[PDB]
Symmetry: D2
Subunit: 329 residues, 4 copies
């Protein structure tokens, strides 16, 4: 049982030994992701784990996989769009994926950003950098249990946000289109308008769909409380960035924590020069009441381990024609 691993990250490499032992298999790590140019390297292998940078679009790959007895495409991510299903069907190559990495990883980054912004630590730092070490009333804070949290969408990640906040004593409201009895201990469902008007901290947990692009814009910011804090660890495209920047500069909201931004593809996950960084990011990055992280909410030891292990399990099951949890086909 030798499984090829394409496009391993530094963090995934640290796990290979442990992983090999636990699964009784060998991992063959290959530095680039899978192309026509290096597929010839699964020959001595019984399966493939993928982290595709770019679309898997040219058929010499899909065919040559089947030539070697490969039956499955084990994506180490949720993201499916990089796989041309037409081809996969064409070579009885199942696709697996990793739908849930660690919902607490993302929930905890959201809560963390919200707390820091609530305590205005950045605004204190910007004051201090100018030699102002006072406690002006404009930097006063409050305990989390005096806050209302509002969730737009819930899911596994929102549910974990609600659990955390409600356990610190906060009131958590949520708009959603589906009803889940299991999250009732931790939040109260309410319609969208109420969530936006009443919440002191608002966090996005909606999927990106054409109906949700820009669902947070000028009109929503105007509805928000002026001291509200917006967090978006879901999808950059949910929020109109210019509307956001302006709302922050107008003080129609108080702060924002973003793990994701529209057009992040140009720069997130890369090294770049100054001329490569867009101007909206530079504006947000200069504000003491804004956090931007490079889509790293997921980035814990647990998520990294699960991405590797979940995908590997499905992928070995399928090598043994055994059944698999996260087929997508």
């Amino acid at each position: 049982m030798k499984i090829a691993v394409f496009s391993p990250s530094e963090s995934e490499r640290k796990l290979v030994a442990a992983t090999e032992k636990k699964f009784g298999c060998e991992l063959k790590l290959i530095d680039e992701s899978l192309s026509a140019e290096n597929v010839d390297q699964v020959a001595d292998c019984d399966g493939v784990l993928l982290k595709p940078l770019g679309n898997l679009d040219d058929e010499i790959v899909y065919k040559k996989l089947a030539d070697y007895g490969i039956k499955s495409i084990g994506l180490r991510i949720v993201g499916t769009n990089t796989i041309d299903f037409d081809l996969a069907k064409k070579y009885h190559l199942t696709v697996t994926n990793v739908p849930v990495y660690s919902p607490r990883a993302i929930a905890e980054m959201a809560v963390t950003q919200a707390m820091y912004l609530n305590r205005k630590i950045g605004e204190f730092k910007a004051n201090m950098d100018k030699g102002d070490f006072t406690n002006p009333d404009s930097l006063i804070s409050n305990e989390i249990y005096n806050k209302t949290i509002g969730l737009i969408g819930v899911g596994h990640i929102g549910s974990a946000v609600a659990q955390i906040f409600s356990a610190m004593g906060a009131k958590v409201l949520a708009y959603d289109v589906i009803y889940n009895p299991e999250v009732e201990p931790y939040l109260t469902y309410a319609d969208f308008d109420t969530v936006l008007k009443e919440a002191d901290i608002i966090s996005l947990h909606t999927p990106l769909l054409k109906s949700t692009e820009n669902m947070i814009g000028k009109k929503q910011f105007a509805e928000m409380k002026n001291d509200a804090i917006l967090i978006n660890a879901a999808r950059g495209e949910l929020v109109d960035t210019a509307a956001l920047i302006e709302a922050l500069e107008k003080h129609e909201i108080a702060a924002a924590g973003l793990d994701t931004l529209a057009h992040e593809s140009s720069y997130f996950f890369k090294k770049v020069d100054d001329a490569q960084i867009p101007a909206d990011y530079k504006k947000l990055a200069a504000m003491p009441n804004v956090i931007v992280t490079p889509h790293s909410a997921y980035f814990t030891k647990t998520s990294v381990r699960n991405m590797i292990e979940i995908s590997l399990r499905d992928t070995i099951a399928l090598a043994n024609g055994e059944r698999a949890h996260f087929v997508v086909s």
Copy 2:
């Protein structure tokens, strides 16, 4: 019922009218701290609420409060250092204070700082500032339910830190010299050495005393885990700053969140020029794995209100010959 209030903060001013209505009393605000210069303004006053900047040394102030029928001194703060208790006894002046502003205010600042540093948000920022938007392993994080929290001292604040951390699923250990059965659902008592050795996040909750000054020094940093996060929202002098800086520079700890620092008195609560700010602060402030705040863990609406309303309440009571909750030796 009229109560003089000396030296109110800006945040304190803002609550005044609501407090009048709530207590059905009148608050006479004096901008400065009580002094021989302003004492005669107490003349039409039932009681006094003090926030002394500096020593209340002169005796004619005390003679004159006693002359005006004033039966106590209501410290709005915790520290009684500037009260010459000798003169107090001489003039039959009970002294009260506010020991417990809001333990949650402080505990939440500690947690917030720990979570931010755990997520290495500032290290991602320093990296992004140089155009690096990747997710290197050196910035991988972890879920809080995988961490051990170590408390040095508990008290009302540490106890609250322990409640919050254990409610997120963390394991919490605490060193203390008195036993409180009511904290055991949230922490496990342990030896001081065990705590430093096993904790991934250390938070300080120890009174500053002769015996506890530089309690956290070179030897203690050497004992901690190298990815440990040190939080001090108790008292700066508990920590040897030089040893802290060195430890961080050598990566013998991963991060530090300080709401208080040795020698902070020179610059905390002031506006100053660059030349007035000490070098140890400047070193800390430059580190992207450090947070420093200007002793603002307390600074929530609840605290500021409690500082007024708890003193006011004991102060009114003693004016009525009734009992105060927080009389002091």
Copy 3:
């Protein structure tokens, strides 16, 4: 939109008005469940909600449903075995069901029974009934945070058990065959032997399968700690009752809370004479360290509401050829 409701319970009747308003439909409640004998009563109706006592086995029902334009069978329960799918397929009659009622309802009954049995309130009552009002050491208890909980199986219900207990400070271990990252904050996975040897309170959350019938028997009881408490709110058939009774009489365990028993079908949900109640139940019912409830863990306002509302939603969607959440076909 008129929906027939068969075999309504007293609790479901209390909801009709509210339900009708919220869904803009009329409910036609019919006292017995659906047979050949009363199916002629869906004529003026656009759908049917069912709570079948007994198998729906005779085709005159399935055919006459289609004759009236009925497209769906809306079960108000999880239980599917009462529907002959061969027939349903034969009349393009979809089957819906209600998979999740309220997991907290069942989790809370489990926790409640565990707590009462931990505090030995029944044993105190049996003492008191004989005139003994003392506090003998054999009736000493302990705080929940000094206990280890062990879950055999997890699921939605076990996950809610773990959440509750771990929030009171208990250590929760769990054996399961599937791995769910989202419950990690609340329990630690461990193998079956460890859960049985180490747990102070053990609660069953395994599905009944031929491989699980009697999975708790003489050998497991002997492995359990002598002061352990077994709770089973899952499926009566998971536990060998005679092995249980004997373990209780031998004091190889301390107590048991059962919401379900093998052969409960003879008596649960019915009114019966003494000669109709089996002897195993009478033995357990006479023990002060045993609770038996008549499979009522589910029985809250929320579960009753959800059973009605979830099934009704799917069933109206299907009347409008719209899509539905809980199809089983």
Copy 4:
């Protein structure tokens, strides 16, 4: 180091050896309470630990402890009623006690009883006893996150009740005459009338004083919701038992859990005959929606140990001229 222990419980006996090892002292156990009859057994003793059944009236006991160099009286209990404090001062005998055994022990008994009664387990039992195994609406229950908890008094115990209930998602309200900022994450202060009117579960945490005797009477039952559950694990005399019985009989409340009852002193902690048990108890004990326990909320391993080790520790300290934590007036 030898410390005499008077009148140990059976549970206390069981810990003795471990306590010796833990304190590195010797414990001389005397079966009876201190009296002129047994005082001379203190002669070889450093200090004393008392559990007085009855008044310690004679003065020669006190003269003789003082004669034997004994510097304090270590009550292992909370109540100091049987200490003639006058004689204590005469003979320079500091008096200490144990105010805080384990607040969680008591709070957990309250919660446990509330949850059992909320789930109406005893009413299902009374029903099953008559062969009725149904789920009538009169026995429908509800999830604890849908309930409001009302506390009359807080303190260390009530506070713990509030932590547990709010961690299950309940809304908790409390009436009190002193403000504690540290409880606000878990409860909201409210007027006494609001609490009785809005609470679905009422739990008492008020000291028995002249002004609080029958604080819960006819008028207060009439104010409560008719499906209210009343819990008293504080002091029996707070509740007018006649009015309690009547209220239950009239279904003006749904249930009651009592760990303490007015006049309990006649039978609690004793073995007695049927003729010695009062009628009000017999009425309560017959109701399947009532629990009565014999003042055993405290009775966990933690409490029994703390009662020994906390007194022992202050007792050793005062023998060393060091400070005690729980000296008493």
